[PDB]
Write a protein that binds this ligand. Structure first.
Ligand SMILES: *[C@@H]1O[C@H](CO)[C@@H](O[C@@H]2O[C@H](CO)[C@@H](O[C@@H]3O[C@H](CO[C@H]4O[C@H](CO[C@H]5O[C@H](CO)[C@@H](O)[C@H](O)[C@@H]5O[C@H]5O[C@H](CO)[C@@H](O)[C@H](O)[C@@H]5O)[C@@H](O)[C@H](O[C@H]5O[C@H](CO)[C@@H](O)[C@H](O)[C@@H]5O)[C@@H]4O)[C@@H](O)[C@H](O[C@H]4O[C@H](CO)[C@@H](O)[C@H](O)[C@@H]4O[C@H]4O[C@H](CO)[C@@H](O)[C@H](O)[C@@H]4O)[C@@H]3O)[C@H](O)[C@H]2NC(C)=O)[C@H](O)[C@H]1NC(C)=O
Ligand SMILES: *[C@@H]1O[C@H](CO)[C@@H](O[C@@H]2O[C@H](CO)[C@@H](O[C@@H]3O[C@H](CO[C@H]4O[C@H](CO[C@H]5O[C@H](CO)[C@@H](O)[C@H](O)[C@@H]5O[C@H]5O[C@H](CO)[C@@H](O)[C@H](O)[C@@H]5O)[C@@H](O)[C@H](O[C@H]5O[C@H](CO)[C@@H](O)[C@H](O)[C@@H]5O)[C@@H]4O)[C@@H](O)[C@H](O[C@H]4O[C@H](CO)[C@@H](O)[C@H](O)[C@@H]4O[C@H]4O[C@H](CO)[C@@H](O)[C@H](O)[C@@H]4O)[C@@H]3O)[C@H](O)[C@H]2NC(C)=O)[C@H](O)[C@H]1NC(C)=O
Ligand SMILES: *[C@@H]1O[C@H](CO)[C@@H](O[C@@H]2O[C@H](CO)[C@@H](O[C@@H]3O[C@H](CO[C@H]4O[C@H](CO)[C@@H](O)[C@H](O[C@H]5O[C@H](CO)[C@@H](O)[C@H](O)[C@@H]5O)[C@@H]4O)[C@@H](O)[C@H](O[C@H]4O[C@H](CO)[C@@H](O)[C@H](O)[C@@H]4O)[C@@H]3O)[C@H](O)[C@H]2NC(C)=O)[C@H](O)[C@H]1NC(C)=O
Ligand SMILES: *[C@@H]1O[C@H](CO)[C@@H](O[C@@H]2O[C@H](CO)[C@@H](O[C@@H]3O[C@H](CO[C@H]4O[C@H](CO)[C@@H](O)[C@H](O[C@H]5O[C@H](CO)[C@@H](O)[C@H](O)[C@@H]5O)[C@@H]4O)[C@@H](O)[C@H](O[C@H]4O[C@H](CO)[C@@H](O)[C@H](O)[C@@H]4O)[C@@H]3O)[C@H](O)[C@H]2NC(C)=O)[C@H](O)[C@H]1NC(C)=O
Ligand SMILES: OC[C@H]1O[C@@](CO)(OC[C@H]2O[C@H](O[C@]3(CO)O[C@H](CO)[C@@H](O)[C@@H]3O)[C@H](O)[C@@H](O)[C@@H]2O)[C@@H](O)[C@@H]1O
Ligand SMILES: OC[C@H]1O[C@@](CO)(OC[C@H]2O[C@H](O[C@]3(CO)O[C@H](CO)[C@@H](O)[C@@H]3O)[C@H](O)[C@@H](O)[C@@H]2O)[C@@H](O)[C@@H]1O
Ligand code: NAG
Ligand code: NAG
Ligand code: NAG
Ligand code: NAG
Ligand code: NAG
Ligand code: NAG
Ligand code: NAG
Ligand code: NAG
Ligand code: NAG
Ligand code: NAG
Ligand code: NAG
Ligand code: NAG
Ligand code: NAG
Ligand code: NAG
Ligand code: NAG
Lengths: 624, 624
């Protein structure tokens, strides 16, 4: 094992555990100190204003198992500090018959048991568990724990009748899944159900969804309501909130609803952020966010989706959320998006970016797997004065259209996503910022044109506005993590409406994924404009490439170039001519970003361990 | 629910939880503070000379589940004090994937991990578990924990490769069971194996047996040897130590070997007590004690047995224990005998006495189930100058015979058992003792003759020597827990050699067991004697009746009379005439015994709880 990054990579599978720990590792985002991580969980803003973030964690292993909550906190979403207690950075772990198989995803009741922050989480025990297996009742239940020390530790309620687990009965038979309880308050849903509370007797101020589905018959999001305000044991099943069909797809802009939902949440937004009205705000829109499984051929069979919904009240005192339009939260290698309320009428969403090493070839050499996305403000994106001649506009696939009275313009509404401003400010202010001169891409443009200032390492952001003619067939974008031999190309092709990440040359190491990422991006053309504009922001952070377009479209992916000098960046141009010209302005390079974990040394590995021969005997965890 | 014990019992199933807590409860013996208990475990003499006793425990329930070690200590086997920590009187409990289904029986390595007392115990996880089920590897494993505070708490080794569990591979396929590790030192076995240690490489000073069997093919006791002295992770399987056949019986004096062994131990004794020689002591005998299951129609299908064995060394460096003769440790409602070494060359044995309420009709009303037997010194019982005309003597069923050179007398050898003298001294000294005049039972004897002094409650001991003619057909014994309407009759019938406990009138409450208990007792006739003698000692302790004959035969049973005045006692006579006379001498009543738990109040119930609907979902524990 040579770690010489000035020459071609050898056989890296000969390298020891965690010898590649720092080589590809993100520095500017939320990531566990070491080992395996997946879904964000237990997210809440604490009483002091700081953010508590939990995550599914398996320390000292590089595959999933004994799944626990690791945790950390931040005052600005950006610079983090690990909790440190008797179990290191873990704060909840398998410990009881009801959760011994894993402490799965959960969410926070801010004023819960004895007034303390309280987590409702999926407690798992033994038996087949999975959407393609024959799971039985009891294998997944829902349990409570509360914290008296602001998340340093959690106390579970006792096991038994009238205690944990608090939700255990399956609401319908033959479930594909029964997990990821999302607890939320909703003046909207309270108003809608106020005339039906005699039917159900459920009058609490908290609702909870549980994500699942029914074998052979598609996904389900089940709605529960807290039975009585101030009491947390009794949750009353109302009915299915979202019901989709077996591998149903709403279309090309909407992924696929698969067979089973995971990590679903419910929110209400308006153009400024989170909306807490009862229905009276006509600018507010109800949204569900959810993962689906087994409706996709790649990306671990996983789509992270969202849908705008219209609530209808059923006669039995339950709610049907009818999908009005349906989109994708991120088009790349990310999943398990969670959202939570933040002071100042915000709803903030964050997900998990998995690696691109699905055959587990270099995982042990890394000594870790996974990171978060950036934290994103959600809001209702409104585009005014849209031209009716925008191609495909009236499909209304992942957006809605409202015509003006005279029919000459359209108002477009969709889900907006943008990186939280605290992170953008910290990134820019801690970086060496190069404001770049605008560039006209025409007949003279090379395929690749390096920026006049270059990054110094694998931690940088790029921004640019690409102005295209309305009938262009040119392509343009950004190349990143680039030397002569390795590079990753981010292209937008307005003619096809496809944003792609071409990764055929991303790395000389052949074991990593190299498939082309793809997102659909609708350039809403403005009345009177003779051009259309793509605003692209790209974060490069170790191996993470995270792309944002027009505060709407997100695509997270991975690139693992070996060579030390595969850090460059610049503009891409294809089919630009004297007549078909792409104007690039607002160009900026932010070199360095922020050290997100200032108290951590560069190498936080503690080595890896094997569970031994009993792992295969129990059959629950891989063991490493 | 009336608790009026001056009138007939009502419907006691209407009574609340623990309303009958003190009614039938032993006071003078080891018993949990409340709830369910079964097998003794973790027995050892601590560095200060006191005795640590653990037991299988399920607090606040009256059926088995979440099985844990409860613990207490004593300086004299007799007066006890509970441990009190964060889990009350528990000191080890299910907490890891490998033991979450129950912390089963274990035994003590006195100088173990870092020099501390260390327990090797059966750690259980999920799956079918039982001799009549299709158990698989991993469901029962063996794990270590050690104590730095003399048994107040235990620290388990970590889960994983080279740590817990330390024994997990099945030594043969299709096991009926794989549990109850018994760790012991043996100069005897070390001497026997010293020429074979090149074959196995196992040279440690500790051995361990694991109890089990093979489906369709009888019970097995598997022998392991510590691989290296001073190291406790690696245990090397040598081979089967004891192999018996599917429901094989050695005869009427020997119970039945069933299909599977439980709680087996290995010891070496001589006439004084424990023997620690290498083979050189010609008076010493090797013994195995073991429970068997499914070889008995009643008594929960359980025989607590023992066998004298002769060790043979196999060519592969293992030991075969060939059964020389085979007996019964207790003939009544007891099981799960454990033995442990005690200072002064002693080996002390104690078991579990279950209730006689197998349909669980009044268990909740009790608020507890189970107690220990008394603690018993084991030794080699030697009877000299036995007459060759003793009937059945040369069957050598649960004893051995050695003829004198001239053939006119025999030396008989068997397992001796007697109550530890610390308990006998404390019982007598704290009791009101009535020394009773001898009684000749002849033609004038009533069926029942009350003693001239009577007990004052349900806590007393009786002793007597019954002298019978060599060809008697008379029966005699003791009646206990007696009023006019309820009583329990203990008979010996020398003609049949049967000691019985007749319980048809033991209680007016009909739900309790009433079957007749039976033990075989061999009166070894002495050369020149014109009579034969049965020395009988009976302990009455709440509902426990514990009978000892000739420091050899033990029979533990239960009686639950309702009436407050069912406490009397006296002599029984049947078929005694002018010519067939039974002489009773050495008669003593000890009224009161000892309060074994002086710090406990009379009612130590903490109520009972239900596990809720998930108990049936998990399918592991009854839930109550
Ligand atoms: C199989 O058996 C298992 C073992 O018995 C069983 O698990 C046990 O279940 C019981 C009953 O449900 C649990 O008991 C509850 O404990 C809660 C507190 O839990 C937290 O604190 C525990 C003890 O605290 C100390 O001891 C530790 C060990 O030494 C130290 O680390 C601590 O520093 C602390 O020490 C201090 O106190 C010591 C004495 O206790 C003292 O010596 C010392 O000097 C020092 O001062 C921890 O053990 C526990 O940790 C476990 O659980 C957490 C998750 O919760 C895990 O992360 C850990 O790994 C570990 O497994 C916790 O940190 C109590 O609050 C709770 O009390 C109340 O509830 C009951 C019934 O509802 C009431 O009777 C009672 O009044 C209390 O209610 C009142 O208070 C609350 C608010 O205060 C209020 O809301 C309520 O209305 C009311 O007013 C109860 O005692 C026990 O924790 C479990 N143990 C373990 C190890 O798991 C298991 O379930 C069984 N399984 C089956 C299937 O049956
Ligand atoms: C799923 O995840 C699970 C959670 O992570 C995981 O379980 C955990 O496994 C790890 C690794 O095996 C265990 O860690 C070991 O812990 C041993 C000590 O255990 C005992 O003490 C623990 C911590 O002590 C404190 O904290 C408590 C909680 O607040 C308090 O109650 C105590 O008072 C005490 O507080 C003091 O210390 C605090 C900081 O620690 C401090 O803040 C505070 O102020 C105060 O001063 C207890 O948590 C633990 O209790 C658990 O386990 C017992 C049974 O053991 C149960 O009865 C309990 O209910 C509970 O579940 C124990 O009481 C360590 O000795 C051990 O250390 C060593 O071994 C490793 C590796 O071999 C070495 O790296 C290290 O150097 C140590 O070795 C050295 O020392 C020893 C002798 O000292 C020597 O022999 C050796 O050669 C060497 O020199 C290790 O850290 C952890 O306990 C597990 N936790 C739980 C909750 O279960 C689980 O396995 C996972 N499952 C799967 C399938 O993967
Ligand atoms: C006395 O001790 C017992 C513990 O043994 C305490 O708890 C009770 O235990 C018994 C088991 O011994 C439980 O009986 C079972 O009950 C279920 C159905 O229960 C439902 O209906 C009840 C009646 O109104 C109700 O009390 C229950 O409510 C509790 O549980 C729910 C969770 O489900 C919880 O939300 C509540 O807060 C309560 O905790 C519940 O809704 C029944 O299905 C069982 O049937 C089996 O057994 C019977 C009898 O052998 C048999 O007929 C059936 O065929 C089947 O095999 C079983 O009867 C009882 O529910 C427990 N009660 C509780 C928890 O309150 C009890 O509290 C102690 N008493 C006191 C005064 O302390
Ligand atoms: C680096 O990180 C790893 C953790 O990932 C550390 O532990 C090793 O993990 C790997 C899994 O990643 C283990 O590999 C498996 O090994 C078993 C067979 O193992 C036996 O033989 C080994 C070789 O000499 C020996 O080391 C083992 O000894 C350990 O375990 C026993 C308990 O069984 C214990 O008593 C000892 O004390 C040791 O702890 C053991 O006897 C093999 O069956 C597995 O095969 C599967 O996977 C492979 C590869 O994909 C595949 O080919 C097979 O078909 C099958 O699917 C697997 O290879 C390895 O045993 C672990 N080693 C340990 C515990 O020492 C490792 O230590 C870290 N290194 C450093 C330097 O820190
Ligand atoms: O990487 C997930 C691994 O967990 C396993 C164990 O069977 O399956 C469980 C479950 O995990 C994933 O679910 C989520 C969101 O992805 O993660 C947590 C569990 O950590 C759970 O609360 C969430 O729903 C996965 O998406 C599911 O499909 C899996 O069924 C492994 O099979 C799997 O590799
Ligand atoms: O009363 C025992 C109850 O435990 C259960 C659970 O399946 O079975 C396990 C096992 O228990 C008994 O085994 C012993 C000695 O009797 O007790 C401990 C477990 O507490 C174990 O280490 C000992 O071997 C019982 O004799 C076995 O037959 C059972 O298989 C219940 O089924 C059972 O009622
Ligand atoms: C990068 O490094 C490689 C090998 O070390 C070298 O061949 C190449 O010339 C360097 N520079 C660029 C821009 O590729
Ligand atoms: C990181 O630390 C681990 C554990 O100490 C060590 O095994 C590994 O070799 C280190 N890796 C690097 C790149 O320093
Ligand atoms: C309410 O009605 C819906 C639609 O039929 C149904 O799916 C749901 O199960 C009902 N709620 C109940 C039975 O609580
Ligand atoms: C919306 O506007 C377009 C173009 O003016 C027209 O084709 C369509 O019919 C309009 N829809 C409604 C509801 O008026
Ligand atoms: C650098 O980043 C830190 C951590 O997020 C932030 O608090 C600080 O304001 C930043 N510095 C700037 C913007 O100059
Ligand atoms: C074509 O592009 C080059 C490079 O941006 C620029 O120098 C030139 O002005 C452009 N041509 C026209 C006609 O604008
Ligand atoms: C654009 O994307 C779609 C997938 O939505 C794909 O079918 C099509 O081939 C792509 N076209 C081009 C030219 O990239
Ligand atoms: C015992 O009590 C019962 C009922 O209280 C009574 O009938 C009987 O006479 C009493 N005495 C005896 C010795 O049975
Ligand atoms: C014993 O205590 C328990 C729990 O407090 C109580 O329920 C029960 O009625 C008491 N029984 C007696 C006989 O005092
Ligand atoms: C017997 O053993 C084998 C594994 O050695 C296993 O496949 C089989 O299921 C076991 N049980 C029976 C009933 O054959
Ligand atoms: C040693 O021989 C015995 C008798 O054949 C056998 O049962 C045992 O399994 C052998 N020991 C091994 C293979 O370790
Ligand atoms: C033992 O003694 C009896 C009676 O003297 C006799 O029947 C038997 O043969 C003797 N056994 C031996 C081995 O001498
Ligand atoms: C009474 O019993 C206690 C506890 O076992 C014992 O220590 C004491 O010696 C006894 N009293 C006597 C024999 O007088
Ligand atoms: C018969 O028994 C009675 C009672 O023990 C006694 O008084 C009498 O002496 C006995 N008869 C003879 C002949 O010993
Ligand atoms: C004595 O006990 C045996 C059981 O070993 C039994 O078969 C026999 O019937 C009993 N005989 C009498 C008279 O009690």
């Amino acid at each position: 094992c040579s770690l010489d990054q000035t020459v071609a990579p050898g056989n890296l599978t000969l390298c020891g555990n965690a010898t590649l720990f720092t080589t590809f590792r993100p520095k500017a985002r939320f990531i566990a100190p070491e080992g395996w991580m997946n879904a964000p969980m237990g997210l809440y803003q604490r009483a002091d204003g700081s953010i508590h973030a939990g995550y599914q964690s398996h320390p000292k292993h590089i595959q999933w198992g004994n799944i626990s909550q690791g945790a950390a906190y931040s005052s600005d979403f950006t610079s983090w500090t690990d909790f440190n207690g008797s179990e290191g950075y873990k704060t909840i772990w398998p410990s009881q018959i009801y959760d011994i198989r894993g402490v799965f995803d959960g969410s926070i009741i801010k004023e819960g048991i004895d007034g303390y922050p309280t987590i409702l989480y999926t407690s798992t025990s033994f038996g087949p568990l999975g959407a393609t297996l024959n799971e039985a009742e009891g294998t997944e239940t829902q349990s409570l724990a509360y914290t008296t020390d602001d998340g340093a530790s959690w106390i579970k309620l006792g096991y038994g009748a009238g205690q944990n687990p608090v939700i255990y009965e399956w609401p319908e038979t033959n479930l594909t899944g029964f997990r990821d309880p999302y607890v939320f308050q909703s003046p909207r849903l309270e108003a809608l159900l106020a005339n039906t509370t005699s039917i159900t007797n459920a009058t609490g101020d908290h609702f909870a969804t549980i994500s699942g589905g029914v074998h052979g018959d598609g996904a389900r999001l089940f709605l529960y309501r807290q039975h009585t305000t101030g009491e947390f044991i009794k949750w009353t099943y109302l009915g299915p909130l979202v019901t989709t069909g077996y591998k149903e797809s709403y279309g090309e802009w909407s992924g696929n609803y698969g067979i089973n939902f995971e990590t679903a949440g419910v929110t209400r937004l308006n153009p400024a952020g989170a909306a807490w009205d009862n229905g009276s705000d006509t600018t507010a829109v109800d949204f569900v966010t959810f993962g689906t499984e087994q409706g996709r051929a790649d990306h671990q069979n996983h789509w992270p989706l969202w849908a705008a919904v219209d609530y209808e009240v059923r006669d039995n005192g339950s709610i049907e959320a009818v999908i009005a339009y349906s989109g994708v939260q991120d088009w790349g290698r990310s999943y398990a998006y969670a959202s939570f309320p933040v002071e100042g009428y915000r709803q903030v969403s964050v997900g998990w970016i998995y690696e691109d090493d699905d055959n587990v070839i270099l995982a042990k050499q890394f000594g870790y797997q996974g990171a978060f996305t950036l934290f994103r403000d959600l809001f209702v994106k409104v585009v005014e004065n849209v031209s009716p001649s925008t191609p495909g506009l009236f499909e209304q696939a992942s957006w809605s259209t409202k015509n003006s009275t005279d029919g000459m313009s359209v108002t477009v509404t969709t889900l907006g996503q943008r990186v939280v401003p605290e992170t953008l400010a910290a990134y820019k202010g801690n970086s060496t910022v190069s404001t770049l001169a605008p560039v006209m891409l025409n007949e003279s443009a090379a395929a690749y044109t390096p920026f006049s200032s270059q990054p110094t390492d694998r931690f940088y952001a790029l921004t640019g506005s690409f102005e295209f003619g309305l009938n262009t067939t040119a392509k343009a974008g950004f190349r990143v993590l680039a030397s002569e031999e390795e590079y990753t190309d981010i292209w937008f092709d307005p003619a096809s409406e496809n944003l792609t990440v071409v990764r055929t040359a991303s790395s000389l190491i052949k074991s990593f994924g190299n498939d082309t990422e793809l997102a659909k991006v609708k350039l809403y053309e403005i009345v009177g404009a003779e051009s259309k504009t793509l605003n692209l922001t790209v974060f490069v952070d170790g191996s993470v490439i995270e792309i944002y377009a027009n505060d709407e479209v997100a695509l997270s992916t991975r690139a693992y170039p070996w060579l030390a000098n595969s850090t460059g960046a610049g503009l891409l141009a294809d089919g630009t001519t004297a007549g078909d010209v792409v104007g690039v302005s607002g160009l900026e390079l932010w070199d360095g970003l922020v050290d997100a974990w200032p108290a951590r040394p560069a190498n936080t590995s503690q080595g890896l361990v094997w569970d031994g021969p009993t792992a295969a005997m129990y059959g629950l965890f891989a063991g490493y």
